[PDB]
Amino acid sequence: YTTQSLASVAYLINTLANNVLQMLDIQASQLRRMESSINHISQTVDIHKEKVA
Amino acid sequence: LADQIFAYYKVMAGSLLLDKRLRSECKNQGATIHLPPSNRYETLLKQRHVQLLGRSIDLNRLITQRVSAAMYKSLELAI
Amino acid sequence: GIKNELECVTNISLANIIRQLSSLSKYAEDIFGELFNEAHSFSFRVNSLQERVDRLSVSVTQLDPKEEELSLQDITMRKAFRSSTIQDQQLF
Amino acid sequence: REIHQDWANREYIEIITSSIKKIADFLNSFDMSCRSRLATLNEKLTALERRIEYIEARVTKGET
Amino acid sequence: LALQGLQLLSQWSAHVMEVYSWKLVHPTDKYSNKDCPDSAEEYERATRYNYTSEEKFALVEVIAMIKGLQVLMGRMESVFNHAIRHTVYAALQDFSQVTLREPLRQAIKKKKNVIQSVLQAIRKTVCDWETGHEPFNDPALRGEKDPFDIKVPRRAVGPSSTQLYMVRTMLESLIAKTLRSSLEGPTILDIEKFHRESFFYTHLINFSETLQQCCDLSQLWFREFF
Amino acid sequence: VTLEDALSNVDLLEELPLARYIEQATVHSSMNEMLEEGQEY
Ligand SMILES: [Cl-]
Ligand SMILES: [Cl-]
Numbered sequence: 001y002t003t004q005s006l007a008s009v010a011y012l013i014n015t016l017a018n019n020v021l022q023m024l025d026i027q028a029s030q031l032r033r034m035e036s037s038i039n040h041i042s043q044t045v046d047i048h049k050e051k052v053a
Numbered sequence: 054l055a056d057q058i059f060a061y062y063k064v065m066a067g068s069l070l071l072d073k074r075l076r077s078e079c080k081n082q083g084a085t086i087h088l089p090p091s092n093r094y095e096t097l098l099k100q101r102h103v104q105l106l107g108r109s110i111d112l113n114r115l116i117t118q119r120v121s122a123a124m125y126k127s128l129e130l131a132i
Numbered sequence: 133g134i135k136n137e138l139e140c141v142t143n144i145s146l147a148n149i150i151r152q153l154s155s156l157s158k159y160a161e162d163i164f165g166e167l168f169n170e171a172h173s174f175s176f177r178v179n180s181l182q183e184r185v186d187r188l189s190v191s192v193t194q195l196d197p198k199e200e201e202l203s204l205q206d207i208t209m210r211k212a213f214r215s216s217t218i219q220d221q222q223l224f
Numbered sequence: 225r226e227i228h229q230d231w232a233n234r235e236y237i238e239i240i241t242s243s244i245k246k247i248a249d250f251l252n253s254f255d256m257s258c259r260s261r262l263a264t265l266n267e268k269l270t271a272l273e274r275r276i277e278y279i280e281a282r283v284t285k286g287e288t
Numbered sequence: 289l290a291l292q293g294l295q296l297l298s299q300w301s302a303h304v305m306e307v308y309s310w311k312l313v314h315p316t317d318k319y320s321n322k323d324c325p326d327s328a329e330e331y332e333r334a335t336r337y338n339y340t341s342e343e344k345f346a347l348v349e350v351i352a353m354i355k356g357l358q359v360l361m362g363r364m365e366s367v368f369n370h371a372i373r374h375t376v377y378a379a380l381q382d383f384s385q386v387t388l389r390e391p392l393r394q395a396i397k398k399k400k401n402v403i404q405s406v407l408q409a410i411r412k413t414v415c416d417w418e419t420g421h422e423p424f425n426d427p428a429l430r431g432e433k434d435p436f437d438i439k440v441p442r443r444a445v446g447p448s449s450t451q452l453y454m455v456r457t458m459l460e461s462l463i464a465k466t467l468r469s470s471l472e473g474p475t476i477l478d479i480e481k482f483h484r485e486s487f488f489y490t491h492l493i494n495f496s497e498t499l500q501q502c503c504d505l506s507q508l509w510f511r512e513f514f
Numbered sequence: 515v516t517l518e519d520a521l522s523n524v525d526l527l528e529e530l531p532l533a534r535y536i537e538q539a540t541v542h543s544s545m546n547e548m549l550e551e552g553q554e555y
Contacts, residue, residue: 051197101263134450210286231416
């Protein structure tokens, strides 16, 4: 029961950790794409304000 | 900490842009504009998880809150 | 004391090891839950930002330089933009 | 005899306890690593939220 | 290294606490510190006014050196736990199985039953023979000298606390007509050697708890007595 | 080689010819428990 318990705990932790890392990796790349998208909007607003000027 | 960090980096900026010839001329006239002492604030600025009483404290985030307010206050004063 | 049976100590101390794995399972769950709750909280903000970023793209494409008039009422009748000034204190 | 079996029993015990400590170590250093990552994500996200507020205000009228 | 680092941490912690401890019983006054009023209450004179700028910096240094090394020692726990267990086992088995042969031979070769009984009890308590059984074909166990080699096993597990207590106490009784005068020169030094070195075994086996006890600065805040 | 080491070698010449531990450990262990109780007080 000891061996079985050690193996089980290690497994469930390994699985949940891997999932958490995957979640953080996805959220990072989300912000990376969003910054790129915000930057292009900002450039577009800059261009527009200059045209009015 | 945030107060002295902002004051430190403002003095650094002011020193960096101060005309070098004027600096030496003042030194010869016996009125040296005293160069600020260097400090070691970076490790504190890199702290994202200070473990205190079971809490995880983002020191970087907290400093930024104040430093950003100080930047805005500087700009308001200039205008 | 010291008079206990060897095999009896072995079994009791192995049973306590399984208890340690029980508490370690609870300790692990708490750790993963605290991290999940923060990242989950970020998800709501990320989704809410992504939609704001997308409907701004639309609003920005529809800007017309030839059309846009400049109003002096933006100075006298409407407030100046202020960015968030919220600061965290009393963290304990 | 029973002492020789005791030595084997306690070696086994030593191996399991060592492995439990390794799990605990991993759990602590995983927590710390994710704390950094969540702080970094919050930093970038907060900035991106602020920037959007700003850009929006450049295109929108103020409150009367 | 494990023992050296624990001793160093202990030295540093003792330094901080001893300075602090001294200051608490010798609060300053106006005569020794010009900035300290006679109106200042004892505790403030014991703490706040009782340290110069240089003393306060030096204290934070040592505190930082303690806590910093505590982190590095803690990160090395798993390696230390294994190496300590291997070393303690090896020292105990080498001593019991091999080193105690000569004094045991001399205990049976002469009529020294009391010394024989304790030396055997020690061997009985801890010896982890590789075959599983004690070697009975041993010349020293009989009384005569060697033409004899024993391969001692290597395990990464220390003795139990009862095993260590019994061995140490039984070895102690030999070196304490006393049982000491009935033993040879080099052998007495051999028991003393192992008895002295085994003093720290419990501490080192319980490394984690010992680490914390060597770095304990928790008492600087408490002030119930004052 | 110290003087007491030389004197001890001479002492050797004048010398030539021509269990309960479990109980004590139980007493010791019992007394230790009192220490822990005293700490609590
Ligand atoms: Cl704590
Ligand atoms: Cl002892």
